């Protein structure tokens, strides 16, 4: 994700929505914190059990911290169990559907 | 869109993000207001020229009014020129990508 980005907020207390100029990302808050804790601790089970879970409301500051750290991860793509940390949609798919150039 | 829904906000001063339990919708603010004005005025060119444009910030109240009216339109799907008023993504596509049931 580009270094210029806009955090749109939380959805279903499970995803953080953040976009750059190319994609809208839906970042799984649990998988992201698990990856953060795994890269620090090198222990998959410990990283999992201490991380936030889906269904927890997160503050705006906590969300900023997580997204900032996400960009610096060695593996921002998949959690230690191999699940994708996020879903992304190209912004052009949204714009093109309504007939707009992007 | 179901009558229970959550407005997530504006994106790129062009789309309103709103979801129900099934889809996340990206509603083109211009195409929506144009459809609203067209159903009232029955004049495509007048409805277009008086409607909000992309690139305009909208207040939270204006966004609420538009989304409320959208659900009551005779044609909430396409503007009078035939463009889709919105893009939608099934929430299950987002959840499934990160390995979650939905
Ligand atoms: Cl979880
Ligand atoms: Cl426009
Ligand atoms: Mg252990
Ligand atoms: Mg006319
Ligand atoms: Na940048
Ligand atoms: Na919600
Ligand atoms: Na409902
Ligand atoms: Na923006
Ligand atoms: Zn676990
Ligand atoms: Zn886990
Ligand atoms: Zn901070
Ligand atoms: Zn995992
Ligand atoms: Zn395409
Ligand atoms: Zn026109
Ligand atoms: Zn128009
Ligand atoms: Zn109102
Ligand atoms: Zn139109
Ligand atoms: Zn699918």
Backbone φ and ψ of A42, nearest 5°: 65, 30
- Residue B6 contacts by C-beta under 8 Å, 6 or more apart in sequence? B18, B19, B20
Here the tokens at position A81 are 């169990």
Measured between alpha carbons, how far is A76 from B96 in angstroms, rounded to an integer?
18
Measured between alpha carbons, how far is A60 from A58 in angstroms, rounded to an integer?
7
Q: Residue A99 belongs to what H/E stretch?
A: none
Sort residue B100 into left (φ over 0), alpha (ψ -120 to 50) or beta: beta
Contact B91, B22 (CB under 8 A): yes
Q: Do B98 and A86 touch (CB under 8 A)?
A: yes
DSSP chain B: --SS-EEEEEETTTEEEEE-SSEEEEEEHHHHHHHHHHHHH--HHHHHHHS--TT----HHHHHHHHHHHHH-S-SSB-TTS-BSEEEEEHHHHHHHTT---
- Residue B75 contacts by C-beta under 8 Å, 6 or more apart in sequence? B35, B39
**In terms of Cα–Cα distance, which of B58, B34, B57 is closest to B47?**
B34
Measured between alpha carbons, how far is A81 from A76 in angstroms, rounded to an integer?
13
Measured between alpha carbons, how far is A64 from B51 in angstroms, rounded to an integer?
35
Q: Residue A4 belongs to what H/E stretch?
A: none
Resolution, in Å, please? Answer: 1.3
Which 28-57 residues of chain A touch chain B by CB within 8 A? 28, 31, 54
User: Is the Cβ of B5 closer than 8 Å to some Cβ of chain A?
Assistant: no
**How many other C-beta atoms lie within 10 A of the C-beta of residue B89?**
18
Chain A residues near residue B28 by CB distance under 8 angstroms: 98, 100
Q: How long a stretch of residues is chain A? A: 102
- Experimental method used, please? X-ray
Chain A residues near residue B83 by CB distance under 8 angstroms: 98-99
Domains defined for chain B, CATH in brackets: 1-102 (3.30.1540.20)
- Residue A21 contacts by C-beta under 8 Å, 6 or more apart in sequence? A2, A4, A91
Three-state secondary structure call for residue A49: helix
Q: Residue A24 belongs to what H/E stretch?
A: strand A23-28
Which residue among A11, A83, A84 sits closest to B8, beta carbon to beta carbon?
Answer: A11
Longest Cα separation, chain A: 48
Report CA torsion sign: A59, B94, B35, A21: positive
């Amino acid at each position: 994700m580009k270094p210029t980005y806009e955090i749109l907020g939380q959805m279903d207390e499970t995803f953080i929505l953040v976009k750059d100029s190319e994609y809208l990302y839906f970042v799984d808050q649990h998988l992201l914190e698990e990856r953060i804790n795994y890269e620090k601790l090198k222990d998959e089970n410990l990283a999992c059990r201490i991380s936030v879970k889906a269904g927890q409301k997160l503050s705006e500051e906590k969300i900023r911290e997580l997204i900032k750290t996400w960009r610096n991860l060695e593996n921002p793509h998949v959690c230690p169990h191999g699940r994708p940390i996020y879903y992304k949609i190209p912004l052009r798919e949204i714009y093109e559907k309504v007939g707009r150039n992007y």
